[PDB]
């Protein structure tokens, strides 16, 4: 029995990752990144990755919600606006189709003095009001919860963050260009911290993400069933140009002694409908590539058709994004209507604007977005989309794919698919019969003996990220100390390698030494004898270095 500390092996594990790099995803509570993207390729290591069971996604989701909520903490809560509104439509030169979208409403508003009221008005979108009992309306959210306005001074720009591992842990990265959602990745590397990932929130189309390698990739937990989303990643960008063409005037209304409401004062010029322009030729070519790949799973000779979204209200059935700070809900019908048989003319999608939103699809709370003065235009590149299959009859063909993606997590699964978090576990035991971090992981047990110091050195190594940092630091220290206490008891303190006075009990393994040390890696070795670790550890604590101290 010989003991080795600093052995380059690991087990899958879940822990807290730390963000590293005003916006709502404030970087105040964030660690600056080291400019050096330290990375070590693992020459002979094959690891199983699983995009669908990756808890890195879940932490990203909950951290984002927390940051979002904290950013609205100091903002004005609009409780005074739950009043009867008296109102009509707007008078202007309007697009004939865009009717009823805007209301011109007046109301009894409070002032900075308790004893005085004022009469004010603001324009509203139809989507944000409810007709109640001639011209009586109310804000839709007063039914369930008064809401805070977004602070006028914070940005919704999705500035990317990186997730870094704590001491004792590492992130493995899959470099296999053809890797689908799951299985053994033949080329594995390792990093201290992930690439920067933008917290872009959208639906039905994936915006500003990473692109695929030369082929469009299709990933699914179970391509066979229909209850799972199919994520499709483009190997090319598709450019979309969106706009909100009306010139709006912003008006500030005092609410109270330190509070103000941002009203829509008026509209300058003709009233036009918001819309997005998609390159038509690009979109068509792109779908042809998607179809080619989908046929690989549904038969060489088959038909693929696309259809628009199905029933739901708004947030469910339409595309969504934040452009310029406005919230757009677009009717992507012109993108998903085609049939693909076996063997500049931009597409224009109409789109609506809404000020009151139920972010993260939660209830009991919401956010009111203030109006933006002027005219909005922005561009983006979609890098993928979310599809669902409908069904069949077994006696026909032409599966239909429809857009979908109700969850938010699918937006981040798409980036984090290349990563996995593991825990580093030294104190390997092997018989002798009494370079880079993890660079030797793919090498033999014998060869690996030369990097024990490398591994050992990486084991100890207002604010949201408060308790999380203290907990991570404490844990790393406790793990370190527990290993040292054990080595101490065993009489191996201060030595990377030590020899016990216990001969190897062959009942634990029956191999020749030359068959171990020159053939197996430590990962393999641990797998063969992990069943007996506790036996050895137990015996070594009392048989020796306790009984021996009376001698």
């Amino acid at each position, epitope marked *: 029995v010989t003991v080795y500390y600093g052995v380059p092996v690991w087990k899958d594990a879940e822990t807290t990752l730390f963000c590293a790099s005003h916006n709502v995803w404030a970087t105040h509570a964030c660690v600056p990144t080291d400019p050096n993207p330290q990375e070590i390729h693992l020459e002979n290591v094959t690891e199983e990755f699983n995009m669908w069971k990756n808890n890195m996604v879940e932490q990203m989701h909950t951290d984002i919600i927390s940051l979002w909520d904290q950013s609205l903490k100091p903002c004005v809560k609009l409780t005074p606006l739950c009043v009867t509104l008296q109102c009509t439509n707007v008078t202007n030169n309007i697009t004939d189709d865009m009717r009823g979208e805007l209301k011109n409403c007046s109301f009894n508003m409070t002032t900075e003095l308790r004893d005085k009221k004022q009469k004010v008005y603001s324009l509203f979108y139809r989507l944000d009001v409810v007709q109640i009992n001639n011209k009586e309306y109310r804000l839709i959210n007063c039914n369930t919860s008064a809401c805070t306005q977004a602070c006028p001074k914070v940005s919704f720009e999705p500035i990317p963050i990186h997730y870094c591992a704590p001491a004792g842990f590492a992130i493995l990265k899959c470099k296999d260009k053809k890797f689908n959602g799951t299985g053994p990745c033949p080329s594995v590397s390792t990093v201290q911290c992930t690439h920067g990932i933008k917290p872009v929130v959208s639906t039905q189309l994936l915006l500003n993400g990473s692109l695929a390698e030369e082929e469009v990739m299709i990933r699914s937990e179970n391509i*066979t069933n229909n209850a799972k989303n199919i994520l499709v990643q483009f190997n090319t960008p598709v450019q979309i140009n969106c706009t909100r063409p009306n010139n709006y005037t912003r008006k500030s209304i005092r609410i109270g002694p330190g509070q103000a409401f941002y009203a829509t004062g008026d509209i300058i010029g003709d009233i036009r409908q918001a819309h997005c322009n998609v390159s038509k030729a690009t979109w068509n070519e792109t779908l042809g590539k998607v179809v080619k790949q989908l046929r690989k799973h549904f038969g060489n000779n088959t038909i693929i058709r696309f259809a628009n979204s199905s029933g739901g209200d708004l947030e469910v059935t339409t595309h969504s994004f934040n452009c310029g700070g406005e919230f757009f809900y677009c009717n992507t019908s012109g993108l998903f209507n085609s049939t693909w048989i076996s063997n500049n003319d931009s597409i224009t999608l109409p789109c609506r604007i809404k000020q009151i939103i139920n972010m993260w699809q939660r209830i009991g709370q919401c956010m009111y977005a203030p109006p933006i003065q002027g005219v909005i235009r922005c561009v983006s590149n979609i890098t993928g989309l979310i599809l669902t299959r409908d*069904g069949g009859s077994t006696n026909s063909t032409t599966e239909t794919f429809r857009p979908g993606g*109700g969850d938010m997590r699918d937006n981040w699964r798409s980036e984090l698919y290349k990563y996995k978090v593991v825990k580093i576990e030294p104190l390997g035991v092997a018989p002798t019969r009494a370079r880079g971090f993890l660079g030797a992981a793919g090498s033999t047990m014998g060869a690996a003996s030369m990097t024990l110091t490398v591994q050992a050195r990486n084991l100890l190594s207002l604010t949201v990220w408060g308790i999380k940092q203290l907990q991570a630091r404490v844990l790393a220290v406790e793990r370190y100390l527990r290993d040292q206490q054990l080595l101490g008891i065993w009489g191996c303190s201060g030595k990377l390698i030590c020899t016990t006075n216990v001969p190897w009990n062959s009942s634990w393994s029956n191999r020749n030494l030359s068959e171990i040390w020159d053939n197996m890696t430590w990962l393999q070795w641990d797998k063969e004898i992990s069943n007996y670790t506790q036996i050895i550890y137990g015996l070594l604590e009392e048989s020796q270095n306790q009984q021996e101290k009376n001698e």
Partner: antibody, heavy 119, light 108 residues
């Protein structure tokens, strides 16, 4: 084109009856299962147990898992052994065939027998 | 692991009228609903494939739609011949398995 079934009737509690289901001729080596469905006397339908008409893997309702067993017996028939029937098992039992959709795991019943009673 | 439920346990209309049946699912199902017509003394007859296509052999009286968590069946131009119990089901084989609704009755 049709399913026929029998072997029910009254057995005193704790006894066993076996139901059989006979096809008039169906494809027993393809993307179909054959499955027992129970109609409690006054309720809608309950799932009992299915067998793939292929490899022969079986699935059992959890309530039926420790009591009922099924197996393919021939190229025309499949049977259900209702081990230890009791008062609670009084019902019309039906034989049905299920199809898939295209490439799926979601099934689609498409053929039913007339059903038979046990007490 | 799911229950399909139906609300309009019993409906009645005169001949030529229209009734609807609403089936609520416990989880997101894309469109996988069968809708069988069942008369006593008879095996159930399939009306719908995929919650909206019609089964071969039924009149264009039967129609329906939905896209998860809720599906409906509409029966127009009712005749006494249509009096029956109507089913709702998801039919999955595996862990989250087969489920049927209570069934509703249409009287004409």
């Amino acid at each position: 084109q049709s399913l026929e079934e029998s072997g029910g009737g009254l057995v005193k509690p704790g006894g066993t009856l076996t139901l059989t289901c006979k096809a008039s001729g169906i494809d027993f080596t393809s993307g179909y299962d054959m499955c027992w469905v129970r109609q409690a006397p006054g309720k809608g339908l309950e799932w009992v147990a299915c067998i793939y008409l292929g490899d022969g893997n079986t699935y059992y309702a959890s309530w039926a898992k420790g009591q009922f067993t099924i197996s393919k017996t021939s190229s025309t028939t499949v049977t259900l052994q209702m081990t230890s029937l009791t008062a609670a098992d009084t019902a019309t039992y039906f034989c049905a065939r299920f199809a898939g959709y295209r490439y799926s795991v979601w099934s689609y019943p498409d053929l039913w027998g007339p059903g038979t009673l046990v007490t | 692991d799911i229950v399909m439920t139906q609300t309009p346990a019993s409906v009645e209309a005169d001949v030529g009228g229209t009734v609807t049946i609403k089936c609520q699912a416990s989880q997101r199902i894309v469109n996988l609903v069968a809708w069988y017509q069942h008369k006593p003394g008879q095996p159930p007859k399939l009306l719908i494939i995929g919650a909206s296509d019609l089964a071969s052999g039924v009149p264009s009286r039967f129609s329906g739609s939905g896209y998860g968590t809720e599906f409906t069946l509409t029966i127009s131009d009712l005749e006494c011949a249509d009096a029956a119990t109507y089913f709702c089901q998801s039919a999955y084989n595996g862990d989250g398995d087969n489920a049927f609704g209570g069934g509703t009755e249409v009287v004409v």
